[PDB]
Amino acid sequence: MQEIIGASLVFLCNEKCEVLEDYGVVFDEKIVEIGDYHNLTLKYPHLKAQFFENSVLLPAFINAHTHFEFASFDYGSFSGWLGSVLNNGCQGAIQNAIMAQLKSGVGSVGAISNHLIEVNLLKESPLNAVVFLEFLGSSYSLEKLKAFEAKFKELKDLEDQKLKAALAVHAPYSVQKDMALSVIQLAKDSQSLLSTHFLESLEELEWVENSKGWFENFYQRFLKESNFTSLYEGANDYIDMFKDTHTLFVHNQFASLEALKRIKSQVKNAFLITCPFSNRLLSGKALDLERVREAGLSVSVATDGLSSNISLSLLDELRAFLLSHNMPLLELAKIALLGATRHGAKALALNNGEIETNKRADLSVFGFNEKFTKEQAILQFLLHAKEVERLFLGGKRVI
Template identity: 25%
Template sequence: MDRDLDVISLKAGYVVPSPGEVIEYGRVLVRGTKIVEVGPYKAPDGGGVEIDLGDVVVIPGLINAHTHLELTDLEGKLSPPKGFAQWLRQMVAFRLDDRNGDLSHAVKRGVQLSLEAGTTTVADIAYTNDSFNILPRLPIRKRVFKEVMSMDPNSVASILEDAIRVLSGFPRENLDYVGLSPHAPYTACEKLYKGSALFSQGQDMLITTHICETEEELEFLNKGTGSLADLLGAYGFLDNWKPPGTSPVSFLKKIGALTKSPWLLAHCNYPRDEELQIIKESGSSVVYCPGSHHYFGHKRHPFPRMLKEGINVALGTDSLASNSSLSILDEMRFVTANYNEVSPRDVFEMATVRGARAVGMGDRVGALSPGLEADLAAIELPGNAGGSVLDRMLQPDARNVFTMVAGRPCYDKHGLFAEKKQ
């Protein structure tokens, strides 16, 4: 960073440092990569640069707790699914197609779209190594999970060995964090889940998986039948597998994978009562992906009940293979419009402080306060809308105009920062 840009004072119509706290006519003072002061506006008294962001609300950078950046170029390419298994068939075909080549371009575009939308942290699930190769060079905070799949216990050792090699080659500093992701109970066998959990616990590393995403998953695990079994069986993926005869989260508990450290559980669309209890006791977080959930036509998500019962719930976009946007702000709007029982404050929490906790960065990001990383977004408010600042921020025409990650402006719609640099 240029020397004169080491101290940045951001002036804004509103600052919302955390849920429920609104500062009118405020400022955020940033030194280097960290926030040093948040409060009512004061003119700068020393060196540095002041940026007047105008009639915006400055908020903590949004956290996307579940996405697949390498699938960004699949936007609009898959036919609308008649069911989850049919969509999965298209994904398997994509994965098996050698012609896809290097997906770095998709990852880059996914990061660009995220930064433009005010997202400063992504939990990215990466099946190929392209994310691992390109992401350290891109200015977004990220936890990249190496995705592993196998329903054959005999192949688990070599799959884990390869995955661990990839993780060990990824920097773990500044903006970069890693993790392991056994894909889902219909693509990862007991041995793969156990091995992944053991490795992650030993490394004190967050682990994630897709779970309870469909009703078919329950039938698959209980009886080994249904559309998922038909699809995966046809590829020969299930030749060495037997159904465990249990529900998905109970399966994780039964094999001992849920002990010791919390998980990041993507979807959890159809948990049974006892599974909610297991999730709560394990201290794991759930990621609700509203756009993707809607795309598949699932029943209403039980996240309001989860929140009431003390489970941490974050928001994710999933990928553009099952959603039309990588914007957490869009997801917040969807939730606000469709779930009257949750308040704008709940929604704001899920996108910030709860998201940060879910991805294991609760002590670094998710709020604006001295000592935390200077990750923030500035949402331009629509002119005539009434209501609270949060209500206005969630209006369809409110737009992110400025994104900062670790003290560095990464998106600046009006070129305010560029003007100051001259």
């Protein structure tokens, strides 16, 4: 059926980043019409209508990078964290970790999975899911190459209207060149998305550029292989593999302006994803947001996983995103809201993240105790938003 909802502040989440006051929207499975809440209640008098005063009505968030496979690990260094994850060499937390996204207002997630453990629970959840099956392998092996293209077939046999199948190549230090050319080709063949970790550390930059640094000893101590040279001969050699695709580039805190200009000019449809908290614990260098826009790209904000973070609430990761950059606060607060909405749905190629006609009815309502001023609404929301009062996904009431 059809129903009307309106709040004292409505965040359209357009590229203009428009906030409207006392507006309402009518929706079924999709968003049909927008306008003033009172004028809408006269136009459609018989539709059920609810208004929320001193509340914010916005799109449901999109978390494009989150691993549900997970103290333990070491923070303060990337080498120390990777060493501590490999010195290590789940079903119940997964059913409660989805609940941490719904209550935070997240309606769509781009989850990276290695063994397809959480995909079954993501299907009964109301969440919009884009599972990237991640490929890990620094030695060529035709045997595992077909054991990975057979696990993807199990993913494509589980697709719905809520779960889309995608594929991921881990990092330039973990995947051999001819094993990624096959993964990338299968994504073109299956017409699915690509996610990848790119220049996340200073040690990976030293490794990819000049075959030096902490990675001389990585393949010997941890992988039982005898390799002492980089799998790729420079940063551009890794990028050109993703030419003419829809590739999600995560982190990129150590990619130079020439490197991101190359990503934009060559990948054609590249989407940079950033996770503020995980960069602090690991590499320690935050993403230069000016360099991002000096190259012509935009960022989405993601929680990453509890592999290198303390809370997977997208709102708490937004505040840490605000504290991590010296940009003018009120402009950067718009980069966060759009990086958690429209920019995250365009990276995942979904039909939500914006209050627009014919878009998915993925709506969040957040209740407060005051009415923020229109000039401050976007920033006051990010500081005080913690839980969600109402969450509508596909026009169905979930929370």
